[PDB]
Amino acid sequence: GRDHRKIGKQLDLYHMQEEAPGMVFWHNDGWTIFRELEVFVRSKLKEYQYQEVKGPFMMDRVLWEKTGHWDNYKDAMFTTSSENREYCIKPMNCPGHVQIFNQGLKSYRDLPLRMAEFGSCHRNEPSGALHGLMRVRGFTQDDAHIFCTEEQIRDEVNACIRMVYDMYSTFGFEKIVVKLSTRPDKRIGSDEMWDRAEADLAVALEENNIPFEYQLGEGAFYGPKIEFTLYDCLDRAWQCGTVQLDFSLPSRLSASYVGEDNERKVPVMIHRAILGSMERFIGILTEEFAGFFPTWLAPVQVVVMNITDSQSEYVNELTQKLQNAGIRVKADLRNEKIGFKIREHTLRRVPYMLVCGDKEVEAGKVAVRTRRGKDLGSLDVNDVIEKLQQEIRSRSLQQLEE
């Protein structure tokens, strides 16, 4: 099946209740998936030279009123009060990043400054419109903001595009639809600015040999955007990625830097998220893989199991070796038949089941079965461990052969 709500219950990943609508309770195994996704995103953040920060959950309404989103989005925002002051719970991470940017004098030498965050966002969405991990009130955005010059825009958008396709390919998503939203009727800035900004987005797509289409007049008042729609194995469309140019917010929040000519200048801001919601993405992945998460993401990667009582100590040593090797491993030493053990952990979607009979113990080997029902044979212990490690390190979609 491919129902994330069904699979999430079956594999004990998460649940949701009426007491907290649209907000996920991550169980151990789901939180393990979440944390590995974070680790993966972080490796891309380091690769693409992003800083990672953390901003507070709430900020004064007075500050949010200055952003120029208040009039359009006030209904979708949670608020809470303290000592005659009203605070918004953050629906976005951008203003918080500007605050960090505003600490200390910034120079042209500091640009481009790429500031990322796994940002916990809350949006007061209608309860009737909520649906599992897909449509949620509380979520974690794989967010970042690039502060750069006008001249630097193309190269930074280019880097964002690459990062998008790079990340989607890891999960097996090759069919990507790209849409470029152009100038709306109500907008800020000159027409010549919009020409350059739109052109920067289009040229950046062309340089990566990406065909796209327009979304005419669908851009925000503060700049144009690119949206990336991935397609799952059922050919269903999921809009996840976004790259949004912004010639408004930095000026609104008093962001500036010292240029090369020694003059004060306002930086351009690029908003981008690739996965979108980490929660929604996990939901998509769950259905894409039908719960058969690639080994690097699997809550339990390996179960080591004995055929009879005879191999219990061998199982313990091999389990410890896998533990030392960094693998998420469990020993199944229960007084149960080998078929019963295999069926259970197959249903739990454990990538590998390492079976130990007499002939395995005697040879210093292990019999490797996959959750797809494949028998890869009896293999040397050290050799299996190094192959498992390589499958995990490279985040491979495929299991071992034989």
Ligand X SMILES: C[C@@H](O)[C@H](N)C(=O)NC/C=C/Cn1cnc2cc(Cl)c(Cl)cc2c1=O
Question: Is residue 121 among the annotated active site residues?
Answer: no
Contact between 273 and Zn ion per CB under 5 A: no
Specify the residue, 62 or 216, whose C-beta has the smaller distance to a copy of itself: 62
Q: Say how far apart CA 7 and CA 322 lie, in whole Å.
A: 27
| Single-letter residue type at 388 | L
CB-based contacts of 395, cutoff 8 Å, min separation 6: 40, 170, 294, 296
Which of the listed partners (ligand X, Zn ion, a copy of itself, none) does 177 bind, with a CB threshold of 5 to 8 Å by partner kind? none
Stretch that binds a copy of itself, among 51-59, 178-186, 340-348, 376-384 (CB under 8 A): 51-59
Question: Is residue 225 among the annotated active site residues?
Answer: yes
Integer-rounded Cα Rg, in Å, for the chain is 25
15 carries a ligand binding annotation: no
CB of 162 to Zn ion, least distance (A): 20
271 carries a ligand binding annotation: yes
Beta-bridge partner residues of 264: 258
Question: What does the buried/exposed string (b/e) look like for 239-264 if buried means 16 or more CB atoms within 10 Å of the residue's CB?
Answer: ebbbbbbbbbbbbbbebbbeeeeeee
CB of 78 to a copy of itself, least distance (A): 5
Residues numbered 5-24 forming contacts with a copy of itself, rule: CB under 8 A: 12, 15, 17-21, 23-24
Locate 174 and state its tokens.
């090759």
Which of the listed partners (Zn ion, a copy of itself, ligand X, none) does 48 bind, with a CB threshold of 5 to 8 Å by partner kind? none
* Binds a copy of itself (CB under 8 A): choice among 6, 31, 203, 316: 31
Question: Is residue 94 among the annotated active site residues?
Answer: yes
Specify the residue, 32 or 244, whose C-beta has the smaller distance to ligand X: 244
Q: Say how far apart CA 153 and CA 176 lie, in whole Å.
A: 22
Which of the listed partners (ligand X, Zn ion, a copy of itself, none) does 371 bind, with a CB threshold of 5 to 8 Å by partner kind? none
CB of 124 to ligand X, least distance (A): 7
Instruction: Give the side-chain half-sphere CA count within 13 A for 125.
Output: 19
Judged by DSSP in three states, 197 sits in helix
Give me the DSSP letters along 68-113.
T-HHHHGGG--EEEETTEEEEEPS-SHHHHHHHHHSS--BGGG-SE
CB of 363 to a copy of itself, least distance (A): 31
CB atoms within 10 A of CB 222: 23
Query: Interhelix angle for 153-170 vs 28-47, to 10°?
Result: 140
CB of 356 to Zn ion, least distance (A): 41
CB 115 within 8 A of CB 100: yes
Give me the DSSP letters along 217-274.
T-SBTTB-EEEEEEE-TT--EEEEEEEEEESSHHHHTT--EE-TTS-EEPPEEEEEEE
Specify the residue, 182 or 378, whose C-beta has the smaller distance to ligand X: 182
* Binds a copy of itself (CB under 8 A): choice among 43, 47, 49, 62: 62
Contact between 319 and a copy of itself per CB under 8 A: no
Question: Is residue 240 among the annotated active site residues?
Answer: no
Stretch that binds Zn ion, among 93-101, 130-138, 225-233, 369-377 (CB under 5 A): 93-101
CB 367 within 8 A of CB 360: yes
| Single-letter residue type at 113 | L
Question: Is residue 141 among the annotated active site residues?
Answer: yes
Pick the catalytic residue from 137, 187, 271, 371. Answer: 271
CB atoms within 10 A of CB 23: 15
Question: Is residue 145 among the annotated active site residues?
Answer: yes
CB of 145 to Zn ion, least distance (A): 6
Which residues would be at the binding site for ligand X (CB under 6 A)? Answer: 69, 73, 76-77, 91-92, 94, 123, 143, 242, 244, 271-273
Query: Interhelix angle for 28-47 vs 278-289, to 10°?
Result: 110
CB of 244 to Zn ion, least distance (A): 7
131 carries a ligand binding annotation: no
Contact between 324 and a copy of itself per CB under 8 A: no
Contact between 271 and Zn ion per CB under 5 A: yes
Binding residues for Zn(2+), by number, are 94, 143, 145, 271
Give the catalytic positions in this structure: 94, 123, 141, 143, 145, 225, 271
What does the binding site for a copy of itself look like in residue numbers (CB under 8 A)? 12, 15, 17-21, 23-28, 31-32, 34-35, 51-60, 62-63, 78-80, 82-83, 87, 89, 96, 99-100, 103-104, 120, 122, 124, 126-127, 137-138
